[PDB]
Amino acid sequence: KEKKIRITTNDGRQSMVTLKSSTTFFELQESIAREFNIPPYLQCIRYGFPPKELMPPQAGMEKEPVPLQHGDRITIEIL
Amino acid sequence: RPNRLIVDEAINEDNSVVSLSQPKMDELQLFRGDTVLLKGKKRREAVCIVLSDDTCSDEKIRMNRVVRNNLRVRLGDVISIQPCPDVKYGKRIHVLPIDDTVEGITGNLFEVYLKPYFLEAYRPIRKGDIFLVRGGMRAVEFKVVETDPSPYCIVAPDTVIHCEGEPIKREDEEESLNEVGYDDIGGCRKQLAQIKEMVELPLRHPALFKAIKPPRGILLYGPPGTGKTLIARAVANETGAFFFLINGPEIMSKLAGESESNLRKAFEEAEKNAPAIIFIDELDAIAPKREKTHGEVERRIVSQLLTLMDGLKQRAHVIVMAATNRPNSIDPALRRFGRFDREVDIGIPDATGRLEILQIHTKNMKLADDVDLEQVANETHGHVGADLAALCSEAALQAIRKKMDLIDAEVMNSLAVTMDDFRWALSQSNPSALRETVVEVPQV
């Protein structure tokens, strides 16, 4: 009942984050805003290899936990 | 040391992914998608990306052929892996092709191979690395001559890639990926694993057998065209053992006395390059059943082969393997203990095996979305690996002839093989082993 996610930004500020199994896109957005000054609307999320894009869920299916798994890294983009 | 890991083959076909077991990943504190700086034998450094793999031993680290060659490392070696967070988005990266793989292909090697390969995947790159890009039914090599952050770099959409032509010659140290590897053989996964367990240790660590017997004769038998020669070449290349092919027809062609001398000198040369593998292709051509032979010179050559195989005993680190169609095809007294004491049955690939062979032989080809290798693999009943390769080549030729009515690498990559072409090739398949006994694990 937890997740351990590395956050790496193109800026170079590497960081660690603790998540929970039930997590929505807004939770990660606000966590990133807390850890880094990047606004939640100026971050484009790439994860995996090839890095799939993780955009905010559209209307209808934004309640379920984000498919992010425990033990992977997330790349952060700055607009 | 935890960072020390034993290399292994990679299921993930991606060129820049290193697969690890999740226990080892967490033990190393390595997060999926992070860069890792593998250390090779001769101070070779390879920057790759780590991905968890459930089917992987903690010590085992799975790598692609390209990564192995970049590190000058073979399966079973030990490599050092640590995280390398200090990776920058290099801007100026100078990359060149390799002449041996860009002969006869024109057009800029960008927007054809390099651009789709990089695109936005953020593939890590290090100075001096060699990577393989598949396209236009050709596997083009590329050497990373320079990177803006020396030496480690990660490509970015805004990264500027320079490909000024002038293909560079292959340095002898580099081992061309055009050479056969364990990933070039499909269908016979079980038989390949058997051959591995049989021959890896004697070839990789001859000193151990020198101290503490080793297998000296392996007889690979099965319908022709199943890649027995392919298997032997793959085993020799992967284990870094000198390979010597002795084609039966080649020996029989030589006149009496010439052939026996040729065989003896081949065996001696293989011995002097120990560890080495001698492949006696089409053994039935050299040593057929006793009744079949009706010539003094033929019996003399068979006896000479027996004498050499016996003389291997006082020799060491030399493994002789041969290809046939059935053990009874070759005469007895060749399977006697010692000389050719071990046997292996390549057999006919099964549905999954045929699918794997098709995937192997269609790597370079660009096949449309409607092409589903599963359906064809089901359709191709009683097909040998050679038959599947010929079928893929026929489909490619069909596509090429269709497009010709309407060589530039852009044109080659533009054409895509369609399921209709594969169906037509099936209609012209002409299987070669439709009568052989079917052995497999039923899918029912």
Numbering used by the authors:
A (entry chain B): 773 to 851
B (entry chain A): 22 to 233, 236 to 429, 437 to 474
The paper states:
The AAA+ ATPase valosin-containing protein (VCP)/p97, known as cdc48 in Saccharomyces cerevisiae, is an essential and highly conserved protein involved in numerous cellular functions, such as regulating protein homeostasis, endolysosomal trafficking, membrane remodeling, chromatin regulation, autophagy, Golgi formation, and others. Its core function is to unfold ubiquitylated proteins in an ATP dependent fashion. Previous studies have established that post-mitotic Golgi reassembly requires presence of VCP, as well as two adapter proteins, VCPIP138, and p4734,35. VCPIP1, also known as VCIP135, is part of the ovarian tumor protease (OTU) family of DUBs, an essential family of enzymes that remove ubiquitin tags from proteins to regulate protein homeostasis and function.
The VCPIP1 ubiquitin regulatory X (UBX) domain engages the N-domain of VCP, which is a well-established primary site of adapter protein binding. The VCPIP1 UBX domain is bound to the flexible N-domain of VCP limiting the resolution of the initial reconstructions which was addressed with C6 symmetry expansion to obtain a high-resolution map and build an atomic model. We observed that the VCPIP1 UBX domain folds into an archetypal UBX domain structure. The interaction interface is mainly formed by F821 on the UBX domain, buried in a hydrophobic pocket formed by VCP V38, I70, and L72. Additional contacts are made between VCPIP1 P823 and VCP A142. We also identified a possible cation-π interaction between VCPIP1 UBX domain R778 and VCP F52. In contrast, the constructs lacking the UBX domain, VCPIP1ΔUBX and VCPIP1ΔVCPID ΔUBX, did not show quantifiable affinity for VCP, while some possibly non-specific binding presumably from interactions with VCPIP1 VCPID and/or SHP box was observed. These results reveal that the UBX domain of VCPIP1 is critical for VCP binding. Using TR-FRET experiments, we assessed the effect of nucleotides on VCPIP1 binding and find that the absence of exogenous nucleotide behaves similarly to the addition of AMP in the complex, suggesting our complex is nucleotide free in line with not observing nucleotides bound in the structure. Although exogenous ATPs were not used for structural studies, VCP N-domains were seen in the up and down conformation for the VCP-VCPIP1 complex and further refinement with six-fold symmetry was done in both conformations, but there was substantially less UBX domain density bound in the up-position compared to the down-position (see intermediates in Supplementary Fig. 2).
